[PDB]
Assembly symmetry: C3
Amino acid sequence: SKKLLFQFDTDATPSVFDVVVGYDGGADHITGYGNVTPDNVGAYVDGTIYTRGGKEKQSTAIFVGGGDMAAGERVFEAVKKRFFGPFRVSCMLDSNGSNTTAAAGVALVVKAAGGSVKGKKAVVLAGTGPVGMRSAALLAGEGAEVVLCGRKLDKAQAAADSVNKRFKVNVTAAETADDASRAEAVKGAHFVFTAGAIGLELLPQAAWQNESSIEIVADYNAQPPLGIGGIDATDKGKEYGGKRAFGALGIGGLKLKLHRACIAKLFESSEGVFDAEEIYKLAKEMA
Amino acid sequence: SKKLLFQFDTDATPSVFDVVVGYDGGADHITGYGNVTPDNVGAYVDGTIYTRGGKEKQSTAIFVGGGDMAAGERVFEAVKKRFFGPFRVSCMLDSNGSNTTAAAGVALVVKAAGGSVKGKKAVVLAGTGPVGMRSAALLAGEGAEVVLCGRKLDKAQAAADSVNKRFKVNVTAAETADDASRAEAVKGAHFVFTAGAIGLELLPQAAWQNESSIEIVADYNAQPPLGIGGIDATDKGKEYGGKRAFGALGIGGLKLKLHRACIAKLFESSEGVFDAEEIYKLAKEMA
Amino acid sequence: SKKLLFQFDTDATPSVFDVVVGYDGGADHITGYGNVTPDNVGAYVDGTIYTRGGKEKQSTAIFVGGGDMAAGERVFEAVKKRFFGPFRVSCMLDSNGSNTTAAAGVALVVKAAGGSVKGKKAVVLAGTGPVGMRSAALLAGEGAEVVLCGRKLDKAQAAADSVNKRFKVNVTAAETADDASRAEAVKGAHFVFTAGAIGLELLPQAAWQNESSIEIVADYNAQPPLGIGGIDATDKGKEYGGKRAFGALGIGGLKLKLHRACIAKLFESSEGVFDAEEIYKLAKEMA
Ligand SMILES: NC(=O)c1ccc[n+]([C@@H]2O[C@H](COP(=O)([O-])OP(=O)(O)OC[C@H]3O[C@@H](n4cnc5c(N)ncnc54)[C@H](OP(=O)(O)O)[C@@H]3O)[C@@H](O)[C@H]2O)c1
Ligand SMILES: NC(=O)c1ccc[n+]([C@@H]2O[C@H](COP(=O)([O-])OP(=O)(O)OC[C@H]3O[C@@H](n4cnc5c(N)ncnc54)[C@H](OP(=O)(O)O)[C@@H]3O)[C@@H](O)[C@H]2O)c1
Ligand SMILES: NC(=O)c1ccc[n+]([C@@H]2O[C@H](COP(=O)([O-])OP(=O)(O)OC[C@H]3O[C@@H](n4cnc5c(N)ncnc54)[C@H](OP(=O)(O)O)[C@@H]3O)[C@@H](O)[C@H]2O)c1
């Protein structure tokens, strides 16, 4: 049977980026839908579970995407709720590539760290967006003491509460309104991630270079000025007098390979569920 | 040339069910459109008839679907009306699966009856919907005496008139507003079909198992309480005393293979027209 | 990698005609979007330039189409504007088949004229539409002396100004408000093209067959009354006395083959820009 991927996007039209990667990952055909909601996705799912049987079923799979993570999460939950008994197919969630980007970034840092980050302090700057929250979640799951920062304490605390409930961890928040506060929050930390919006700087070279404790820095922003000063986007473990760095493009290379590999995995079984935990498990096997 | 199927759906977005079946039927690519109407479909059809010539033409085809049978029929007529001379391609109509469902059901019953039902009495309970109407048409074309029943003579006689004019047959109507009247209507019948809306019982175990004249019963409702009591939805010719029963899922298994086979036929010529009659002819071959 | 074509149509839904030709031109997959504007196309383009690298870049391409040429040009310019450095893919513009139609027409006439029209006079009747304007541009590029006519001088001059600025040529405009003026305008001309709206006659038989200077005539209107009287739409170099005629269908046959061949070119490099000039270059090779 041909491998058919059904793309459910919460935005008005399906993401072009997700279509290309889906095909390069092995889909024979991709059929996409926009404006997908928790109320209209059930009928679409029925079409994937009552049309093929047995080993044929694994050749159909579902991918959920779009620009708003919370919206994708509501659709993803409604998809899983429609399945019942043996009537199911594999599914994946990766709105705006946040799960694959956060998983690639954390896997690279944990590997470069020797394989463990337990008990160590980790700081995610501008960690209130989807990549920062998923990054905080995966680090916390690895045992690190995570502090999620943002300009305003309420938003920062809301993000940690959200992450804590979903992944059952205990991330703490902190307000850092300026570069100065951001320099302080970083003191005593062993790992520092900058998950800021595109084209903004958050931690100049001084701010991280003179902190004996810092082992690794990782930046998700690929547009200059970069989130971390003193490094290049292509950096991928590059040495900087003690500290090692991973730039956005070095992280991006793995994210792309990871996304492709997850798509292929969707067709090897009819019961895969790929959200942050499972995507990160695969990321560690590929880093 | 690649086998290209153009899917025209009357609902807001195209049916996922119809997409999977189309690829398993052999289409190389399926391009779908939602909110298709009798007015906008003409321009879509031009794209299928003026882009390929000669032997190439049979490699493009059209499929009309959606949840409303009436809307689908209006669009299908607009499609056939657009063709002119040699400028045409094969087309199929199967809104809400009404044609393939009714064709599989009748084909299975006629086969289990020995191959001929000429002159026998067949009763279709709640036969005023698309599935009941198409079933009555096909039975009447096979020569059976058909009585289409519903809660109000008004609507039942209109359903019968519609079928009679479209298929050139002579189905009669009858009013059965309650259990008792329903049980009464099946006396003396050889074949009984329940084509009621989903989740409703129309013929309890005690209304058919004690009528000697009845040879075969068939139910299209797959949601408990089933249309026929005393059987399982998966029954496919299972014997109950001296009678045989077909459950909605037993019928559905053939409906799926039939729907796949019809799509493949669309690419074997550029003049095929697959509506109830032709879909039924193929159903008999495969039953 | 699979050859992926992304279709951006300015209308509500993507053209069926453009999809079929795109597959016959060699695309492995076509993903179409409707309602595309200069504003929302940027995010779409990003998806085609950040998902593949190196030799895989050329396996993704863009096609802009739809019914309104002006809307299409705006989107096409926005697409080229999003590219930067090596981050780009091949792209093509053919809203309403205006580029492939004008290129096929001019190529056929130039070949029939011995391969050169330099220094000769070409008149384009009702040349204010997109087909008429593109035809005038290619003819002027061949060194012909071109006169673009229309019922009102201001509109005709605006058309020539547009063409002259865009292709850097020097087409002249003239007002021909009635039958008498159109007949006067072609006296002494060597080539006459009728690019009027569908179903209108612009050049009666007696208005061209008695003019000794006229060598070849071409008509883009396929709906009777044809733009040029006394010819058949299927004519493709048919001789009438000392003259050759090309009708709308004779021209359309090359347009179709040309459109297919252009799509194939898009995947041969990641820098192709298929607008009128490059499409005409290929038309000459194929006429
Ligand atoms: N290439 C890929 O495949 C890919 C995929 C996904 C993401 N990414 C990249 O990874 C990064 C993370 O994405 P994201 O979507 O999670 O980010 P986001 O939601 O756009 O922004 C992250 C946070 O940055 C903070 N911020 C915004 N403007 C700021 C300013 N002027 N000063 C200080 N803080 C500011 C906000 O935190 P507070 O308001 O709490 O301060 C915001 O929650 C982005 O740079 C994005 O480009 C790349
Ligand atoms: N799995 C598939 O591929 C597939 C495809 C199509 C259909 N189906 C199933 O097959 C059946 C037929 O579909 P359909 O669309 O023709 O049905 P429908 O139009 O939904 O219903 C059929 C008839 O049921 C009668 N009815 C409604 N409520 C009733 C009640 N409370 N008591 C008695 N009669 C009642 C009505 O007739 P009166 O008003 O005249 O009494 C109505 O015309 C359904 O169960 C449907 O789920 C399955
Ligand atoms: N088969 C294909 O692939 C294909 C594709 C595209 C176009 N075409 C055909 O080629 C032709 C050119 O298309 P187009 O889009 O450029 O045309 P258009 O924009 O529809 O019309 C061209 C010009 O015709 C003139 N006109 C309109 N009504 C007129 C009338 N009643 N009397 C005299 N002149 C009138 C107008 O010029 P003024 O107002 O300046 O006088 C108008 O600008 C059409 O016949 C079309 O069907 C075929």
